[PDB]
């Protein structure tokens with residue numbers, strides 16, 4: 581997260597860290613046994629880390645649970661990042677509490693101008709590399725489809741939206757991939773792609789979760 585602030589320990593209780601001996605992606609807890617993340621975060625060997633603030637110190641409230649399986653959207657395209665969404669089933673159910681809690685899926689899509697909260701442990705500089713120990717937060721609005729398409733002509737599908745700031749300085753970045761975009765208490769986006777980080781006229785692009793609720797529900801019920 582570039583241009584953001586320290587969230588405060590366990591203030592974003594649905595945020596998870598995907599770990600394979602290091603933090604590589606975020607995700608969101610959607611019930612006690614399932615996490616939503618980005619398909620481009622797929623790999624084998626994933627440990628899900630819940631209840632984290634400082635990802636480099638055991639502070640208390642952490643739960644570490646192996647992934648039992650990871651379900652990449654069958655129509656994910658690695659070229660275009662269309663359908664950049666994946667479900668992860670936990671080997672055992674998380675213990676839900678005030679510091680580890682699920683986030684609601686949306687019942688309708690969010691409109692342009694809606695203010696959202698984006699969170700992650702990704703890089704905090706636009707030029708250079710600086711990864712934080714603790715969780716960072718960014719408030720950002722959803723942009724109109726016309727502004728999104730003007731920023732990335734030909735590359736925006738109906739399964740994507742832009743969010744952020746055209747004047748630059750404030751964005752998600754590498755290491756934030758897969759994490760949540762929460763608007764009015766509901767999960768509306770997944771950190772997906774962008775052009776650099778926090779560059780002028782190049783806002784972040786996010787998977788549009790409202791297009792996948794029926795797929796998520798059908799997949800979880802059958803697995």
Ligand SMILES: N=C(N)c1ccc([C@H]2[C@H]3C(=O)N(Cc4ccc5c(c4)OCO5)[C@H](C4CC4)[C@H]3[C@@H]3CCCN32)cc1
Pocket residue numbers: 620658659660661735751752753754755757771772773774775776777778783784785
């Ligand atoms: N908020 C953001 N500014 C933002 C920037 C970059 C990313 C992601 C993602 C990203 O931008 N790309 C490159 C990319 C670039 C442009 C594209 C792409 C893919 O598909 C269609 O158009 C990667 C996908 C190919 C696997 C992925 C990469 C992984 C760590 C950081 N990158 C996340 C967030």
Ligand SMILES: [Ca+2]
Pocket residue numbers: 632633634635636637638639640642
């Ligand atoms: Ca920790």
